[PDB]
Write a protein that binds this ligand. Sequence first.
Ligand SMILES: *C(=O)CSCCNC(=O)CCNC(=O)[C@H](O)C(C)(C)COP(=O)(O)OP(=O)(O)OC[C@H]1O[C@@H](n2cnc3c(N)ncnc32)[C@H](O)[C@@H]1OP(=O)(O)O
Lengths: 4, 159
Amino acid sequence: DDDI
Amino acid sequence: GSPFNVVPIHNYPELMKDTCALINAEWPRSETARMRSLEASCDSLPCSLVLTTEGMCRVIAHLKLSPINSKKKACFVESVVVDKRHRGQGFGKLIMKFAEDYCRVVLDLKTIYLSTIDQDGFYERIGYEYCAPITMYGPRHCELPSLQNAKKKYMKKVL
Ligand SMILES: *C(=O)CSCCNC(=O)CCNC(=O)[C@H](O)C(C)(C)COP(=O)(O)OP(=O)(O)OC[C@H]1O[C@@H](n2cnc3c(N)ncnc32)[C@H](O)[C@@H]1OP(=O)(O)O
């Protein structure tokens, strides 16, 4: 998933 | 011979704006926000790996290896994305296997964790097991709540  | 090459982003600043565009095509954020994540890449953790080719004219795939506060022998892989027109062509499995070998051989790690909302079938195929949720931060933590967090399915692979 999107790290940020 | 094969022209494909997986490289750490901190040695290829020329690929940073292409990598930002790649990730932002899937999860739209500001270019600067993506640059901040890529600029943190180093030879331990965190580290961003990109799949490129001879001539480095493009970026095919990206993933980020991130440290886990409570697990010194593990890491969290995040922001796994393959260029849309290159999907379904083995590049996702390629960069995941490269990262797994990189963590085991170079970083001497024992486990890789990840979370996914709807692509757990891809990770199950390449050898990941469903597991209980983990956190990469310490206990002095509070972030803005989002319903997406409870949707995440956590998975792990013992290297
Ligand atoms: C957090 O960041 C991690 S979770 C977010 C995943 N990223 C994402 O959703 C962004 C958009 N999609 C991609 O970037 C990309 O499609 C991946 C990373 C999800 C997968 O990359 P590839 O398209 O390049 O996959 P391949 O390496 O070509 O396929 C390998 C084998 O796995 C099968 N597969 C792929 N997705 C599957 C799902 N959802 N369910 C079951 N099986 C899946 C492929 O068919 C392929 O099968 P083989 O038998 O040929 O090995």
